């Protein structure tokens, strides 16, 4: 229905050549309908309905189930998740023992996670597959992973990779993705290290990838603007900075910046001294006044469980409707997202990174705050793309607060160093 038809034709052409595909495109343009169109056109071309694999994190597992339920209801959908007895019921339910193409057998769609690939790799060592889809392949780039071992050992004989950012630039993960595309040709990392570095590597990787950007369609998505806030330390946040180095790793050096109560709570405990002893939290409240005055949808991201469990104390004073997601049950990830995209009276969300910043449809919010989202720009780009998808009806303002003259400045510079490498290449 869009320009993805020539993309799937190019993927089918390189399929007819016989090599495995690479997509290097940011998530948000709707690669799911592209993938189901690829499977539909393969079933129209040479009539395969049976062995198909979808490897997908648990946050987007029920999501992908939802779009394949709404869009193409011709296939027979089989979820593969849960406890051990239901897992055995499912393993019985594809009894199979009839290879190649089958028409009246309900094993059309297998959906699973990386871990249930890994923990049932003995159970899935058999059953020679035909076509696997591995979505969001940021989690496969490490060559020392057990998931890497059991995904290399699969003899499905087609290793199409779907990912948002393959551009992590770890000097080895390029060789890892090349080795996963074709294992025979790419094995020696030292030969790739030995074989002006910026110019030459452009034409090495040229024919395998497709060059797409979000600035090709009409931009009603909200053209997200990075407004940043820099603040000083409070005197309680000042004194911790010298009593940390008085006894003298970086993990407790990070949470000292967020809140002084992250090591000692005030006891007999006033909230007004609790909120003003952290200047980061102090500047949240002034922003929170004008956004509530506009009456606006607010999205909050988070990194650590300690800071994850403090805003709901702060949200008691405003009595805000708020639902946190992280550890949370996947069936609770079903309705609460469904509550978000239906209820308009809900405003506040506490999210972690690897669950909510991957592939969840969040088009009804635009104001996203990054509290400490500075560990990896690739996850931050994925977290921004989780809200900035097709369907957002207004301009997107991305507030990103920071504390000045701290270790965050060195961490943001190391983030900006990883930023400028990956956007060029």
């Amino acid at each position: 229905k869009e320009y993805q038809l020539k993309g799937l034709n190019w993927l089918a052409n390189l399929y007819d050549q016989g090599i495995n595909g690479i997509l290097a495109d940011e998530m948000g343009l709707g690669k799911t309908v592209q993938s189901i169109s690829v499977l539909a056109h393969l079933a129209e071309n040479h009539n395969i309905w049976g062995p198909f694999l979808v490897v997908t994190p648990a946050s987007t597992l029920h999501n992908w189930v939802n779009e394949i339920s709404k869009f193409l209801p011709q296939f027979k959908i089989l979820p593969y998740w849960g406890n051990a007895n239901d897992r055995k019921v499912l393993r019985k339910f594809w009894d199979r023992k009839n290879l190649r193409y089958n028409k009246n057998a309900p094993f059309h769609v297998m959906v699973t996670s990386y871990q249930m690939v890994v923990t049932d790799a003995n159970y899935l060592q058999k059953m020679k597959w035909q076509y696997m889809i591995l979505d969001e392949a940021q989690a496969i780039k490490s060559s020392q992973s057990s998931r890497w071992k059991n995904l290399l050992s699969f003899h499905c004989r087609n290793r199409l990779l779907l990912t948002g950012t393959p551009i992590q630039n770890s000097m080895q993960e390029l060789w890892a993705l090349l080795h996963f595309i074709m294992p025979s040709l790419f094995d020696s990392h030292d030969e790739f290290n030995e074989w002006q570095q910026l110019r030459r590597l452009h034409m090495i990787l040229k024919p395998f990838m497709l060059r797409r950007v979000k600035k090709n369609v009409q931009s009603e998505l909200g053209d997200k603007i990075e407004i940043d806030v820099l603040c000083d330390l409070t005197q309680r946040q000042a004194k911790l900075y010298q009593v940390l180095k008085s006894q003298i790793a970086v993990m407790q050096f990070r949470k000292v910046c967020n809140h002084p109560d992250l090591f000692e709570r005030a006891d007999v405990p006033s909230m007004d001294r609790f909120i003003t002893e952290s200047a980061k939290l102090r500047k949240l409240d002034e922003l929170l006044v004008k956004l509530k005055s506009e009456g606006h949808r607010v999205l909050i991201y988070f990194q650590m469980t300690k800071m994850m469990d403090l805003m709901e104390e702060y949200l008691t004073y405003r009595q805000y409707n708020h639902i946190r997601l992280d550890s949370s049950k996947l069936e609770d990830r079903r309705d609460l997202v469904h509550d978000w995209q239906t209820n308009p009276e809900i405003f506040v969300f506490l999210l972690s990174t690897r669950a909510g910043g991957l592939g969840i449809n969040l088009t009804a919010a635009d104001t996203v705050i990054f509290y400490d989202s500075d560990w990896n720009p690739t996850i931050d780009s994925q977290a921004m793309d989780r809200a900035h998808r097709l369907g957002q009806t207004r301009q997107v303002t991305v507030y990103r607060l920071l504390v000045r003259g701290t270790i965050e400045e060195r961490m943001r510079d190391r983030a900006k160093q990883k930023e400028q490498v990956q956007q060029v290449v």
Partner: peptide, 22 residues
């Protein structure tokens, strides 16, 4: 035969309950 059909129906119902509500 009837037991096999009942087991297949129970498996389909379990896959429907876990697949549409979880």
């Amino acid at each position: 035969r009837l037991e096999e059909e009942k087991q297949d129906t129970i498996n389909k119902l379990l896959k429907k309950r876990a697949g549409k509500s979880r």
